[PDB]
Amino acid sequence: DIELTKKDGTVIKLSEYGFIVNDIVIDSMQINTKYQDKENMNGRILMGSNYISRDIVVPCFCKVKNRSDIAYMRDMLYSLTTDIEPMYLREIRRKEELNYRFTQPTSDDYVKLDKNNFPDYEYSRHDQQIYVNGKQYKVIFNGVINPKQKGNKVSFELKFETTELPYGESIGTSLELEENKKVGLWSFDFNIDWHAGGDKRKYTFENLSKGTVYYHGSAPNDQFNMYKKITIILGEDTESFVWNLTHAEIMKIEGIKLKAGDRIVYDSFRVYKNGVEISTETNISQPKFKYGANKFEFNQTVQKVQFDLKFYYK
């Protein structure tokens, strides 16, 4: 219940700004269907079906000490939130409906009050809220009205909306999973084994014709807009270079001659032959990680493969 927003150049959270929130409700993704009805047949063909948009709603109110200040506070809200600038929203929850604790009415152990006139139930460090999950959402704002209930309390009804892709982009790459350097950004929503360096954590293999990958993301990383990015030290010289993959298509690189120690950066629908001067004419096919086991099969025992990606959720 804070509605964190990471904008291009800053980080903001509402309750820091005197802005309590009632709740956050996140719709699912609007499935746009594409059916076609045959003329006299009791059944209609599915041309397609496709996720579109994940409309968020967040009603937030605010109290202040005096009626004038309402105006300022409201303006702050707009200047703080209503941003066409695609932002990264992060949801927050509490772990408990906190109450005031027992005290002693002996002219001592009195109660605290926040900067806003409320009772601080958060006595200890471990009371305040948490990033409930290690993911974000690429988000933009839609119109709000501000009904002023009595006093200094005024409500607002934010209506956020997904920007590019209706998915729960996981923050942090898969290499931070590999190297346990960055802390946070890994919630139990992702069923992740502790065996760092073990299987289903590793995306850095060496000297293999074929290997195994566990894509922890329920949603499939077929869309190029996702940050799926591979880089391979090819290991062995060749004239052509095929690699296959399951839950995806076959990939070739024919017609250009390579060398062993040369490396390929295989970005989404894009191929850096040696990091620059992209040679992407050969078999334009992009790979697709669906969920769980995504087994790959090279053909000449690359001396290194490693690939970072982002986990996406539905």
């Binding site: 045959k38 003329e39 006299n40 047949m41």
Partner: protein, 177 residues
């Protein structure tokens, strides 16, 4: 229609004018006369002429047809057949012929609807065929130059009159000898 190929108006060759029965109440009008013709007899010159007449008071009935399957199934429309239509409150009981038909068939070759046109196929389609004939006859040619056309035709015509002048000179010079 019997004057020779080289005359073009000294109107030998079965000069005549005909008319239909309805003329006498409508009166004096006339279409483009049957100028082009190398036909000898007069039996032709009345048939073709009355055909030029009666083809022109045009009637296109672009009605719509709706198929009844459970009842009246024996009406699969086929072009070039006789049919007896009759619309009350229209002044119509005569019989006509189909000239266009338009079937659709979803699955199991069951019909959904029909469209038809009677007599002449349409006013519409006549216009459209006229347009497409213009647009395809043009662009099949090569003499066309949109910037000042008629150079290709006027060059030709002036060449023709010039050779005719030279031929006149030759005629005089030969009749001399």
């Amino acid at each position: 229609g019997n004057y020779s190929g080289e005359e073009t108006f000294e109107h030998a060759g079965l000069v005549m004018e005909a008319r239909s029965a309805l003329a006498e109440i409508y009166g004096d009008i006339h279409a483009e006369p049957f100028k082009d013709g190398k036909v000898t007899d007069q039996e032709t010159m009345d048939k073709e002429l009355q055909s030029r007449l009666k083809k022109s008071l045009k009637q296109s009935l672009s009605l719509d047809f709706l198929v009844l399957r459970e009842s009246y199934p024996e009406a699969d429309p086929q072009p070039g057949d006789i049919v007896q239509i009759k619309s009350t409150k229209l002044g119509l009981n005569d019989l006509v012929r189909i000239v266009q038909v338009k079937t659709i068939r979803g699955i199991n070759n069951v019909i959904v609807k029909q469209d038809v046109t009677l007599g002449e196929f349409n006013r519409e389609q006549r216009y459209m065929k006229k347009v497409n004939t213009a647009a395809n006859y043009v662009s099949g040619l090569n003499d066309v130059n949109l910037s000042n056309p008629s150079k290709a035709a006027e060059n030709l015509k002036s060449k023709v009159a010039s050779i005719a002048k030279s031929t006149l000179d030759l005629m005089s010079r030969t009749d001399l000898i």
